[PDB]
PDB file of all heavy atoms in Angstrom:
ATOM      1  N   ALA A  12     109.478  80.346  38.102  1.00 10.43           N
ATOM      2  CA  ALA A  12     108.525  79.708  38.999  1.00 10.43           C
ATOM      3  C   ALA A  12     107.859  78.464  38.395  1.00 10.43           C
ATOM      4  O   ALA A  12     107.814  78.289  37.173  1.00 10.43           O
ATOM      5  CB  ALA A  12     107.442  80.724  39.388  1.00 10.43           C
ATOM      6  N   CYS A  13     107.264  77.606  39.260  1.00  8.21           N
ATOM      7  CA  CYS A  13     106.457  76.467  38.793  1.00  8.21           C
ATOM      8  C   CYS A  13     105.361  76.997  37.875  1.00  8.21           C
ATOM      9  O   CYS A  13     104.788  78.048  38.169  1.00  8.21           O
ATOM     10  CB  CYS A  13     105.823  75.784  40.007  1.00  8.21           C
ATOM     11  SG  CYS A  13     107.000  74.911  41.044  1.00  8.21           S
ATOM     12  N   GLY A  14     105.125  76.311  36.777  1.00  8.06           N
ATOM     13  CA  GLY A  14     104.011  76.602  35.890  1.00  8.06           C
ATOM     14  C   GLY A  14     104.188  77.712  34.885  1.00  8.06           C
ATOM     15  O   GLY A  14     103.218  78.055  34.200  1.00  8.06           O
ATOM     16  N   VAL A  15     105.409  78.288  34.765  1.00  5.52           N
ATOM     17  CA  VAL A  15     105.623  79.336  33.745  1.00  5.52           C
ATOM     18  C   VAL A  15     105.829  78.790  32.341  1.00  5.52           C
ATOM     19  O   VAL A  15     105.664  79.545  31.375  1.00  5.52           O
ATOM     20  CB  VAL A  15     106.759  80.302  34.117  1.00  5.52           C
ATOM     21  CG1 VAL A  15     106.461  81.001  35.430  1.00  5.52           C
ATOM     22  CG2 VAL A  15     108.114  79.589  34.138  1.00  5.52           C
ATOM     23  N   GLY A  16     106.208  77.522  32.228  1.00  8.92           N
ATOM     24  CA  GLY A  16     106.448  76.909  30.925  1.00  8.92           C
ATOM     25  C   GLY A  16     107.899  76.581  30.622  1.00  8.92           C
ATOM     26  O   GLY A  16     108.259  76.509  29.447  1.00  8.92           O
ATOM     27  N   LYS A  17     108.753  76.353  31.658  1.00  8.26           N
ATOM     28  CA  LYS A  17     110.163  75.997  31.440  1.00  8.26           C
ATOM     29  C   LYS A  17     110.298  74.667  30.675  1.00  8.26           C
ATOM     30  O   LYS A  17     111.101  74.546  29.734  1.00  8.26           O
ATOM     31  CB  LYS A  17     110.908  75.858  32.777  1.00  8.26           C
ATOM     32  CG  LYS A  17     110.902  77.123  33.614  1.00  8.26           C
ATOM     33  CD  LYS A  17     111.713  76.902  34.894  1.00  8.26           C
ATOM     34  CE  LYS A  17     111.077  75.878  35.828  1.00  8.26           C
ATOM     35  NZ  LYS A  17     109.733  76.306  36.314  1.00  8.26           N
ATOM     36  N   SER A  18     109.534  73.664  31.115  1.00  9.28           N
ATOM     37  CA  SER A  18     109.573  72.362  30.484  1.00  9.28           C
ATOM     38  C   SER A  18     108.982  72.436  29.082  1.00  9.28           C
ATOM     39  O   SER A  18     109.579  71.893  28.160  1.00  9.28           O
ATOM     40  CB  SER A  18     108.854  71.340  31.356  1.00  9.28           C
ATOM     41  OG  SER A  18     109.506  71.208  32.615  1.00  9.28           O
ATOM     42  N   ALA A  19     107.867  73.170  28.888  1.00  7.19           N
ATOM     43  CA  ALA A  19     107.215  73.302  27.576  1.00  7.19           C
ATOM     44  C   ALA A  19     108.115  74.016  26.580  1.00  7.19           C
ATOM     45  O   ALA A  19     108.192  73.610  25.412  1.00  7.19           O
ATOM     46  CB  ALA A  19     105.889  74.042  27.702  1.00  7.19           C
ATOM     47  N   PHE A  29     104.462  70.624  21.682  1.00  7.08           N
ATOM     48  CA  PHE A  29     103.934  71.294  22.877  1.00  7.08           C
ATOM     49  C   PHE A  29     103.386  70.341  23.905  1.00  7.08           C
ATOM     50  O   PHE A  29     102.409  69.647  23.616  1.00  7.08           O
ATOM     51  CB  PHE A  29     102.850  72.320  22.502  1.00  7.08           C
ATOM     52  CG  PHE A  29     102.185  73.041  23.657  1.00  7.08           C
ATOM     53  CD1 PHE A  29     102.941  73.703  24.612  1.00  7.08           C
ATOM     54  CD2 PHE A  29     100.806  73.112  23.750  1.00  7.08           C
ATOM     55  CE1 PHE A  29     102.328  74.399  25.644  1.00  7.08           C
ATOM     56  CE2 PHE A  29     100.197  73.805  24.785  1.00  7.08           C
ATOM     57  CZ  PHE A  29     100.962  74.461  25.716  1.00  7.08           C
ATOM     58  N   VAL A  30     103.978  70.328  25.115  1.00  4.51           N
ATOM     59  CA  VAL A  30     103.480  69.461  26.185  1.00  4.51           C
ATOM     60  C   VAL A  30     102.448  70.196  27.054  1.00  4.51           C
ATOM     61  O   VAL A  30     102.735  71.246  27.636  1.00  4.51           O
ATOM     62  CB  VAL A  30     104.590  68.776  27.027  1.00  4.51           C
ATOM     63  CG1 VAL A  30     105.328  67.725  26.200  1.00  4.51           C
ATOM     64  CG2 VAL A  30     105.557  69.792  27.617  1.00  4.51           C
ATOM     65  N   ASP A  31     101.231  69.658  27.073  1.00  3.78           N
ATOM     66  CA  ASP A  31     100.064  70.159  27.801  1.00  3.78           C
ATOM     67  C   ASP A  31     100.254  70.070  29.308  1.00  3.78           C
ATOM     68  O   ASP A  31      99.799  70.931  30.060  1.00  3.78           O
ATOM     69  CB  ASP A  31      98.828  69.346  27.394  1.00  3.78           C
ATOM     70  CG  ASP A  31      97.637  70.225  27.119  1.00  3.78           C
ATOM     71  OD1 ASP A  31      97.157  70.883  28.069  1.00  3.78           O
ATOM     72  OD2 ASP A  31      97.192  70.271  25.951  1.00  3.78           O
ATOM     73  N   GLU A  32     100.912  69.014  29.740  1.00  5.60           N
ATOM     74  CA  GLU A  32     101.236  68.740  31.113  1.00  5.60           C
ATOM     75  C   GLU A  32     102.566  68.020  31.088  1.00  5.60           C
ATOM     76  O   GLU A  32     102.851  67.234  30.172  1.00  5.60           O
ATOM     77  CB  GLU A  32     100.141  67.881  31.774  1.00  5.60           C
ATOM     78  CG  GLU A  32      99.149  68.719  32.560  1.00  5.60           C
ATOM     79  CD  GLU A  32      97.914  67.992  33.057  1.00  5.60           C
ATOM     80  OE1 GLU A  32      97.254  67.307  32.240  1.00  5.60           O
ATOM     81  OE2 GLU A  32      97.599  68.122  34.262  1.00  5.60           O
ATOM     82  N   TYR A  33     103.425  68.376  32.025  1.00  5.05           N
ATOM     83  CA  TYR A  33     104.738  67.774  32.161  1.00  5.05           C
ATOM     84  C   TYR A  33     105.083  67.795  33.638  1.00  5.05           C
ATOM     85  O   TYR A  33     105.004  68.848  34.258  1.00  5.05           O
ATOM     86  CB  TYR A  33     105.791  68.546  31.376  1.00  5.05           C
ATOM     87  CG  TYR A  33     107.057  67.745  31.203  1.00  5.05           C
ATOM     88  CD1 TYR A  33     107.082  66.615  30.398  1.00  5.05           C
ATOM     89  CD2 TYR A  33     108.209  68.071  31.902  1.00  5.05           C
ATOM     90  CE1 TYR A  33     108.244  65.876  30.233  1.00  5.05           C
ATOM     91  CE2 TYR A  33     109.382  67.352  31.736  1.00  5.05           C
ATOM     92  CZ  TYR A  33     109.401  66.262  30.884  1.00  5.05           C
ATOM     93  OH  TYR A  33     110.553  65.531  30.729  1.00  5.05           O
ATOM     94  N   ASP A  58     116.673  72.022  32.517  1.00  8.06           N
ATOM     95  CA  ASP A  58     115.327  72.492  32.818  1.00  8.06           C
ATOM     96  C   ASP A  58     115.119  72.292  34.325  1.00  8.06           C
ATOM     97  O   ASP A  58     114.873  71.174  34.778  1.00  8.06           O
ATOM     98  CB  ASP A  58     114.332  71.636  32.000  1.00  8.06           C
ATOM     99  CG  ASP A  58     112.872  71.801  32.355  1.00  8.06           C
ATOM    100  OD1 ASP A  58     112.478  72.908  32.751  1.00  8.06           O
ATOM    101  OD2 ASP A  58     112.104  70.825  32.181  1.00  8.06           O
ATOM    102  N   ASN A 117     106.763  84.223  28.709  1.00 26.77           N
ATOM    103  CA  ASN A 117     106.098  83.111  28.045  1.00 26.77           C
ATOM    104  C   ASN A 117     104.557  83.186  28.091  1.00 26.77           C
ATOM    105  O   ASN A 117     104.011  83.986  28.843  1.00 26.77           O
ATOM    106  CB  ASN A 117     106.616  81.781  28.595  1.00 26.77           C
ATOM    107  CG  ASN A 117     106.208  80.587  27.782  1.00 26.77           C
ATOM    108  OD1 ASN A 117     106.337  80.557  26.543  1.00 26.77           O
ATOM    109  ND2 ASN A 117     105.657  79.589  28.445  1.00 26.77           N
ATOM    110  N   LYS A 118     103.867  82.387  27.249  1.00 26.13           N
ATOM    111  CA  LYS A 118     102.402  82.339  27.162  1.00 26.13           C
ATOM    112  C   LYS A 118     101.827  83.558  26.420  1.00 26.13           C
ATOM    113  O   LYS A 118     100.720  84.004  26.721  1.00 26.13           O
ATOM    114  CB  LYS A 118     101.719  82.104  28.528  1.00 26.13           C
ATOM    115  CG  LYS A 118     102.283  80.902  29.295  1.00 26.13           C
ATOM    116  CD  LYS A 118     101.359  80.441  30.435  1.00 26.13           C
ATOM    117  CE  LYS A 118     102.019  79.383  31.286  1.00 26.13           C
ATOM    118  NZ  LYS A 118     101.038  78.749  32.235  1.00 26.13           N
ATOM    119  N   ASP A 120     100.510  83.795  23.584  1.00 24.95           N
ATOM    120  CA  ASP A 120      99.291  83.426  22.853  1.00 24.95           C
ATOM    121  C   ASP A 120      98.006  83.708  23.667  1.00 24.95           C
ATOM    122  O   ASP A 120      96.925  83.758  23.085  1.00 24.95           O
ATOM    123  CB  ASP A 120      99.332  81.924  22.541  1.00 24.95           C
ATOM    124  CG  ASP A 120      99.479  81.094  23.794  1.00 24.95           C
ATOM    125  OD1 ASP A 120     100.634  80.947  24.281  1.00 24.95           O
ATOM    126  OD2 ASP A 120      98.451  80.635  24.326  1.00 24.95           O
ATOM    127  N   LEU A 121      98.117  83.823  24.995  1.00 23.43           N
ATOM    128  CA  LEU A 121      96.974  84.045  25.872  1.00 23.43           C
ATOM    129  C   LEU A 121      96.553  85.508  25.892  1.00 23.43           C
ATOM    130  O   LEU A 121      97.401  86.405  25.873  1.00 23.43           O
ATOM    131  CB  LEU A 121      97.313  83.594  27.305  1.00 23.43           C
ATOM    132  CG  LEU A 121      97.605  82.111  27.505  1.00 23.43           C
ATOM    133  CD1 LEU A 121      98.011  81.820  28.947  1.00 23.43           C
ATOM    134  CD2 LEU A 121      96.418  81.275  27.153  1.00 23.43           C
ATOM    135  N   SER A 146     105.805  81.839  23.058  1.00 18.56           N
ATOM    136  CA  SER A 146     104.654  81.021  23.281  1.00 18.56           C
ATOM    137  C   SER A 146     105.162  79.627  23.056  1.00 18.56           C
ATOM    138  O   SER A 146     105.423  79.265  21.910  1.00 18.56           O
ATOM    139  CB  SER A 146     103.528  81.334  22.302  1.00 18.56           C
ATOM    140  OG  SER A 146     102.489  80.397  22.538  1.00 18.56           O
ATOM    141  N   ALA A 147     105.297  78.837  24.117  1.00 20.11           N
ATOM    142  CA  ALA A 147     105.672  77.434  23.966  1.00 20.11           C
ATOM    143  C   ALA A 147     104.531  76.671  23.246  1.00 20.11           C
ATOM    144  O   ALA A 147     104.786  75.603  22.723  1.00 20.11           O
ATOM    145  CB  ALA A 147     105.916  76.796  25.323  1.00 20.11           C
ATOM    146  N   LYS A 148     103.286  77.196  23.247  1.00 19.67           N
ATOM    147  CA  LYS A 148     102.144  76.558  22.592  1.00 19.67           C
ATOM    148  C   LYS A 148     102.269  76.646  21.072  1.00 19.67           C
ATOM    149  O   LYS A 148     102.175  75.621  20.401  1.00 19.67           O
ATOM    150  CB  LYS A 148     100.817  77.154  23.094  1.00 19.67           C
ATOM    151  CG  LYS A 148      99.575  76.486  22.479  1.00 19.67           C
ATOM    152  CD  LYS A 148      98.283  77.066  23.026  1.00 19.67           C
ATOM    153  CE  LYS A 148      97.072  76.434  22.374  1.00 19.67           C
ATOM    154  NZ  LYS A 148      96.610  75.224  23.119  1.00 19.67           N
TER     155      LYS A 148
HETATM  156  N1  LIG B 202      98.794  78.732  26.519  1.00 12.40           N
HETATM  157  C1  LIG B 202      99.995  78.388  26.897  1.00 12.40           C
HETATM  158  N2  LIG B 202     100.194  77.516  27.832  1.00 12.40           N
HETATM  159  C2  LIG B 202     101.554  77.183  28.202  1.00 12.40           C
HETATM  160  C3  LIG B 202     102.581  77.766  27.568  1.00 12.40           C
HETATM  161  N3  LIG B 202     103.720  77.169  28.202  1.00 12.40           N
HETATM  162  C4  LIG B 202     103.295  76.349  29.063  1.00 12.40           C
HETATM  163  N4  LIG B 202     101.992  76.312  29.061  1.00 12.40           N
HETATM  164  C5  LIG B 202     101.159  75.523  29.939  1.00 12.40           C
HETATM  165  O1  LIG B 202     101.446  75.909  31.296  1.00 12.40           O
HETATM  166  C6  LIG B 202     101.596  74.760  32.141  1.00 12.40           C
HETATM  167  C7  LIG B 202     102.979  74.721  32.825  1.00 12.40           C
HETATM  168  O2  LIG B 202     103.979  74.408  31.852  1.00 12.40           O
HETATM  169  P1  LIG B 202     105.334  73.656  32.217  1.00 12.40           P
HETATM  170  O3  LIG B 202     106.227  73.450  31.060  1.00 12.40           O
HETATM  171  O4  LIG B 202     104.864  72.373  33.025  1.00 12.40           O
HETATM  172  O5  LIG B 202     105.844  74.711  33.339  1.00 12.40           O
HETATM  173  P2  LIG B 202     107.163  74.491  34.278  1.00 12.40           P
HETATM  174  O6  LIG B 202     106.510  74.182  35.696  1.00 12.40           O
HETATM  175  O7  LIG B 202     107.726  75.982  34.285  1.00 12.40           O
HETATM  176  O8  LIG B 202     108.076  73.448  33.731  1.00 12.40           O
HETATM  177  C8  LIG B 202     101.259  73.535  31.260  1.00 12.40           C
HETATM  178  O9  LIG B 202      99.871  73.227  31.465  1.00 12.40           O
HETATM  179  C9  LIG B 202     101.569  74.044  29.834  1.00 12.40           C
HETATM  180  O10 LIG B 202     100.855  73.388  28.764  1.00 12.40           O
HETATM  181  C10 LIG B 202     102.337  78.767  26.539  1.00 12.40           C
HETATM  182  O11 LIG B 202     103.277  79.358  26.036  1.00 12.40           O
HETATM  183  N5  LIG B 202     101.036  79.024  26.278  1.00 12.40           N
END
Side-chain angles (χ1 to χ4, degrees):
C13 290
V15 300
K17 300 182 294 298
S18 298
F29 178 53
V30 291
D31 225 295
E32 263 170 310
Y33 195 69
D58 170 32
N117 192 48
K118 309 196 188 191
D120 57 278
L121 296 176
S146 175
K148 182 178 178 90

